[PDB]
Amino acid sequence: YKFPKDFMFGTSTASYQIEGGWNEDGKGENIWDRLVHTSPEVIKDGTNGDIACDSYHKYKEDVAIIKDLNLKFYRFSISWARIAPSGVMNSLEPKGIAYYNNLINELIKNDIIPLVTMYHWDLPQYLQDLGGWVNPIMSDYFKEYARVLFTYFGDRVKWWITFNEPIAVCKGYSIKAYAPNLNLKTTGHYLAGHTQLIAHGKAYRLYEEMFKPTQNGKISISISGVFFMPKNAESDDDIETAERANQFERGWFGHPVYKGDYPPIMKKWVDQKSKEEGLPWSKLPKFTKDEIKLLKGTADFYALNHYSSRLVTFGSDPNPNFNPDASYVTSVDEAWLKPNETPYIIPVPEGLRKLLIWLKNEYGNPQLLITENGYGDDGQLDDFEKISYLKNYLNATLQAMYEDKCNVIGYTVWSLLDNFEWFYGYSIHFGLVKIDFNDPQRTRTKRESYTYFKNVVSTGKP
């Protein structure tokens, strides 16, 4: 198989992970600045995003590399606190707006489509002091932020993602996995998810009413998660468990946006767990009729981030990344493991094929853009395991397209550049391009995977 001529290839970064310039040009403090500066020990290699790839200054070089790759689009995120230091949009910083205008204009003059992520985890700290995403008022603050983005950039930006990986944003509140590094457990988990969903819906409907008539763009939300398969493929029990685990992982966000309301299985299980805990109301908030209508239909394409998969059966998982309200325990198929240190991302290309089918069947075969896929390693230039991962996942994508008729419209490699991998710091290297983080000039060096991907983009053949 090969990718068709009109297939969209791209690459992605995120603001905090590459930009640096963390306190330059009036930029406000965000929750990642706060975390790395006041709890530096939380980053496993003792690093921070103060400088990162210095793409705040080096963005023209980033665009030149994208142009050399001949990519159709570049997915990047906008730092809310560069635009409005407090997160409140009555005080805008023109220098922050200018940076993103400069990047957008650089992309367009090089015939690259900008695909903009509004929120990739860098909440302004003032808004976190209100409680951030577990405070329902945050959806109105997000709506106003989106308004400003559409106003300043929407004449040129026609592809938008509201939220990157809302599940990960939730985990920053619930299980100390990301900024703001709180331990609110499942109660906080669902509060953060609910607010992000309402925020998404408000932004989409605002776009529809106030900007789409003249801008004619598209919006989605990048829904991620570990994909789950039955431990025993012949067990009805395990098949049921996998469906529940999948609905809890990604149906949580997709069901409201595509089908209306939360997944029925989440209502059942969360309401019951809440009763078992003696809580006066369910941990899963209830949408109003009007909110269900607000949210249903708020994606013009399905945006998928995907990395890996696990087997499941009924039980309890010691890893807090797996939602205990769904009562599944994960495992890794022996076939996926090798006699060495386990990679950061365990390659399970069959999982992507099966996930694409799952999404096709659950949501009526929406046009689907893979907004992130990639593999992170020790940063060697001969990154052959990364090449193999990309090749195998690209082939899984082609199988889903041509064998199972999945409406996949594009694919995005995470990432163009090595970058700050959150609590792992620079220690995990996802880049097609190596960055020397010990060099003040943050020198770029192309890896073997760069040439591999360049060739796939040109020929359509993994």
From Swiss-Prot:
Which amino acids does the record list as binding substrate? Answer: 17, 120, 164
Pfam family example for this protein?
Glyco_hydro_1
Designated name of the protein: Myrosinase 1
What's its top-level EC category? hydrolase
Domain of life of the source: Eukaryota
Q: In which tissues is it expressed?
A: Expressed in the skeletal muscle tissues surrounding the head, abdomen and thorax. Not expressed in flight muscles (at protein level).
Quaternary structure and interacting proteins, as annotated: Homodimer.
- In Gene Ontology terms, what is one molecular function of this protein? beta-glucosidase activity
To which species is this protein native? Brevicoryne brassicae
Q: Active site: which residues?
A: 165 (nucleophile), 372 (proton donor)
Q: Which family does it belong to?
A: Belongs to the glycosyl hydrolase 1 family.
| Catalytic function, reaction form | a thioglucoside + H2O = a sugar + a thiol
Reported function: Hydrolyzes glucosinolates to a labile aglycone. This rapidly undergoes spontaneous rearrangement, eliminating sulfur to yield a number of toxic metabolites. Thereby developing a chemical defense system that exploits and mimics the host plant.
Question: Record-annotated residues binding Zn(2+)?
Answer: 37, 50
Q: What PROSITE patterns is this protein classified in?
A: GLYCOSYL_HYDROL_F1_2
